[PDB]
Amino acid sequence: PSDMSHGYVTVKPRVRLHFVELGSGPAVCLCHGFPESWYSWRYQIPALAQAGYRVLAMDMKGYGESSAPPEIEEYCMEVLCKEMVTFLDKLGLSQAVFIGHDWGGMLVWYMALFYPERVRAVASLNTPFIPANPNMSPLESIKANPVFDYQLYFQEPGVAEAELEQNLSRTFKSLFRASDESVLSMHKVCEAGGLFVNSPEEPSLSRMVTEEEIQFYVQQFKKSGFRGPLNWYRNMERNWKWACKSLGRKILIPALMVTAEKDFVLVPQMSQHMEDWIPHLKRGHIEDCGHWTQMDKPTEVNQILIKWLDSDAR
Numbered sequence: 001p002s003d004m005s006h007g008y009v010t011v012k013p014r015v016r017l018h019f020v021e022l023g024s025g026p027a028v029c030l031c032h033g034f035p036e037s038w039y040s041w042r043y044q045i046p047a048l049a050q051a052g053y054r055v056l057a058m059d060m061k062g063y064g065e066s067s068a069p070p071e072i073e074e075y076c077m078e079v080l081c082k083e084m085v086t087f088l089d090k091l092g093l094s095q096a097v098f099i100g101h102d103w104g105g106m107l108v109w110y111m112a113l114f115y116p117e118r119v120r121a122v123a124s125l126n127t128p129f130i131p132a133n134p135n136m137s138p139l140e141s142i143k144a145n146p147v148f149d150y151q152l153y154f155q156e157p158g159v160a161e162a163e164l165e166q167n168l169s170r171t172f173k174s175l176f177r178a179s180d181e182s183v184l185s186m187h188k189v190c191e192a193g194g195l196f197v198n199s200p201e202e203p204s205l206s207r208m209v210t211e212e213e214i215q216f217y218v219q220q221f222k223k224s225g226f227r228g229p230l231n232w233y234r235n236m237e238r239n240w241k242w243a244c245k246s247l248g249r250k251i252l253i254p255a256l257m258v259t260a261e262k263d264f265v266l267v268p269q270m271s272q273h274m275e276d277w278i279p280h281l282k283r284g285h286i287e288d289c290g291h292w293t294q295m296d297k298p299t300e301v302n303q304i305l306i307k308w309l310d311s312d313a314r
């Protein structure tokens with residue numbers, strides 16, 4: 001943080017967005033996932049800057065140095081996307097390439113759908129683009145696939161917050177792990193009543209993360225907790241209604257889908273038949289890569305993005 005430039009943008013009277021800036025050239029906006037920070041793109045920030053790009057590694061709403069209102073409604077895709085447009089207006093940017101991972105990936109897909117005039121090119125790590133069905137309920141879709149059982153536990157406000165905020169060191173040591181080191185069962189939750197059951201009181205340090213890196217996520221999450229980041233899940237009824245309003249309109253700006261082979265939550269199989277809605281959709285498959293794409297295989301992520309940006313985003 002000391003060797004990094006920190007930017008702040010007041011998108012709403014009570015909502016302020018934090019971001020780190022490095023490099024010159026076309027604007028590249030990076031959107032992290034859950035329970036992450038701008039620090040998740042630590043290997044991408046100088047790499048994309050050297051390639052000739054103005055990197056904007058965001059601290060998403062409810063995370064780190066950015067504002068965290070307790071209201072659930074403030075974390076729906078409609079208000080989040082509108083805040084990201086205001087962020088571009090206040091920075092004097094007409095266009096920017098939006099690259100998202102996990103929940104940030106969902107945001108970048110919606111941004112390309114509703115505001116294509118502000119999105120130059122779009123890239124998504126692990127997160128697929130699925131058009132919503134107006135006949136099927138959002139809760140029915142979650143209950144259909146057993147892997148998304150953890151989402152039901154994340155619905156009731158305060159329940160997951162108490163477990164995730166309990167021991168932040170234990171929280172990130174159990175979560176930030178490679179798929180071969182993974183001690184978490186996502187389909188076991190709402191039956192056991194907690195995300196960390198198999199994981200012990202003092203979990204071992206993963207090969208992809210150091211003690212210094214783990215403590216950074218602890219101090220950043222000490223500012224607001226988990227209420228803000230968890231509210232991204234609590235708008236499943238609101239996001240579906242907004243996604244159903246687009247029904248018919250397709251993306252037209254260059255797109256990239258990056259899949260992680262060993263990701264058990266956001267499987268590469270979920271991205272199947274995405275080339276029916278397309279529009280330009282280029283692919284990048286990373287073998288022996290877990291959920292934390294940027295942490296697991298940092299070099300392969302840098303190689304895929306730099307190659308894609310210079311050929312479609314410039």
Ligand SMILES: COCCNC(=O)Nc1cccc(Cl)c1
Pocket residue numbers: 034035102103104105106127150175195265266291
């Ligand atoms: C766009 O959909 C994002 C959903 N993915 C999602 O929640 N994934 C997730 C990643 C790390 C830890 C936990 Cl508990 C969940």
